[PDB]
């Protein structure tokens, strides 16, 4: 078996800049049987290059492949925002093997999130569980800090975050953070706050509600 | 229109068996090696099995040898994968794939892919979701938010839409999250101008085919 190491793990670039992706094999790949795929979330892989450098049918000219033996390259000369994806290399000279891919973020100007907080429904408190949701709509970069405070006590372990992919239009992210509680601990408290701290924020934003509103 | 369509995925208990099918169109099927490739959730791609145009040469990855069997029928433009003795590692989206044409050997690279079918290996039971509403508040820059909380369901996936496809702008639907329950959950939210809370109704349509669940929750101000 051959191992394919891709570098870097992530690549964040502005539109127009040139991306350079690398794939290094643990051995030599016979006849330079190396391919490059593009995969966007929820979709199947789209073959870009194969045989090191032959562009697949219908692929823009900016996608070019280089390399030989153990060092192969994928170059993306111009960058459109529709290039936020993961890019895999694959050899077929040996079993066939894939790399783990190189994520490609599209860079843009700093954008602060608008924050919303959702108290649990009352259908759901009948269920016996309380879910408190905090939304962070369309911001950049992805790096953001969300924290729950219940009666002004910082919470730990009872939160799960979920993030959208980069928007195709404006290349932003939107984030969900769900704080899960029992019906009991939920009603033994009053003030539920969600505190967001982000790069495009002068200082942390806090959205909250009192259980009687 | 070159097309590959997989079928036969779903939830199966560990040790169980499942048969995958992939129908193909738009090319001379009997002159092509057909290939199966899988992708576990969150991970990369892993080639599973391939078969030459006349079944003379059959190839398996060591991860599935002795357990998976591949076969085709050039009279139905179809390739098959009999999976047996299924493990948790076999939980993946299984792709049926075709090489770019004129390739020198059976296993190469793959220009055409199917939509993929998802095989969940788990003894957990299929469970429909619980759809709770995220009622709109009462405003950042004149913007309001609202959505549906899709709580506790297994296995993947669920689809969510708003006003059965009509509302698309401002929607941000999130990847599912694995609770310690072992069940999945997700939210789907919409950002709207505050005033249009009176001039439009917002109905979220949740769909869980793994349990034939169809939910239409109407979201109103609380
Ligand atoms: O019917 P033929 O013409 O050939 C029979 C084959 O057994 C033969 O190729 C064999 O010797 C070598 O295969 C190789 O060795 C393994 C023997 O089993 C094969 O493995 P596999 O069986 O696993 O084959 C792997 C790979 O070669 C194929 O999947 C495929 O990509 C090829 O392209 C196809 O074949 C055309 C010839 O190379 C190509 O035409 P091509 O125009 O290049 O296709 C482009 C493509 O875009 C479009 O065709 C498609 O969109 C619509 O069709 C493709 O159609 C091959 O690797 O019969 C031939 C042949 O036996 C000999 O020439 O005399 C016979 C006269 O009729
Ligand atoms: Zn690997």
Numbering used by the authors:
A (entry chain L): 1 to 94, 97 to 215
B (entry chain H): 1 to 138, 141 to 224
Reproduce the article's own wording on this structure.
CPS of Hib consists of polyribosyl-ribitol-phosphate (PRP) repeating units and represents its most important virulent factor. Here we employed a Fab fragment derived from the full-length human CA4 IgG, belonging to the non-A2 family of anti-Hib mAbs, for cocrystallization studies with Hib oligosaccharide DP2 or DP3. Crystals of DP2 and DP3 oligosaccharides complexed with the human Fab CA4 were determined in the orthorhombic space group C2221 at 2.29 and 2.74 Å resolution, respectively, with a single Fab copy in the asymmetric unit. Our study demonstrates that the minimal structural epitope of Hib is comprised within two repeating units (RUs) where ribose and ribitol are directly engaged in the hmAb interaction, and the binding pocket fully accommodates two RUs without any additional involvement of a third one.
Surprisingly, the DP3 bound almost identically to DP2, only with the Fab H chain and involving only two RUs, suggesting that two RUs of the native Hib polysaccharide are required for optimal binding. No density appeared on the floppy Ribf B′′′ or the phosphodiester bridging Rib-ol A′′′-Ribf B′′′, likely protruding outside the antibody cleft occupied by the DP2. For completeness, both Rib-ol A′′′-Ribf B′′′ were included in the final model with zero site occupancy and not refined. As a consequence of the similar binding mode of the two OS fragments, most of the interactions established by DP2 are nearly identical in complex Fab-DP3, strongly suggesting that the first two RUs represent the crucial anchoring core for Hib carbohydrate recognition. The only relevant difference between DP2 and DP3 takes place in Ribf B′, which loses its interaction with the Arg53 residue. This finding demonstrates that the third RU (especially the Ribf B′′′ group) is relatively free and mobile since it is not critical for antibody binding, explaining the diffuse electron density for this portion of the DP3 OS and the STD-NMR results.
